[PDB]
Amino acid sequence: SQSIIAYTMSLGVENSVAYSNNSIAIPTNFTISVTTEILPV
Amino acid sequence: TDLICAQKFNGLTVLPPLLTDEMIAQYT
């Protein structure tokens, strides 16, 4: 029961970041990410 | 700065862009 559907391209998840004069966000944790980049020579 | 339709009258197809003016302005 599957077929081809048409839709408007989504622009991504909409997230409104809070903003205040005295408010600040600092990361409490981190991570080490390894990616892959392919450049033809 | 129609001329777009005028080019399509001679057999030259103009493909519309994937990202519209509203979509590009949202990224900005």
Distance CA B27, CA B19 (A): 10
Contact A9 B27 (CB under 8 A): no
The count of other CB atoms within 10 Å of the CB of residue A4 is 4
Which chain B residues are Cβ-neighbours of A11 within 8 angstroms?
23, 26-27
Distance CA B6, CA B12 (A): 9
Q: By the 8 A CB rule, do A12 and B23 touch?
A: no
The experimental technique behind this entry is cryo-EM
For this experimental structure, what is the resolution in angstroms?
3.5
Q: What is the largest CA-CA distance in chain A?
A: 54
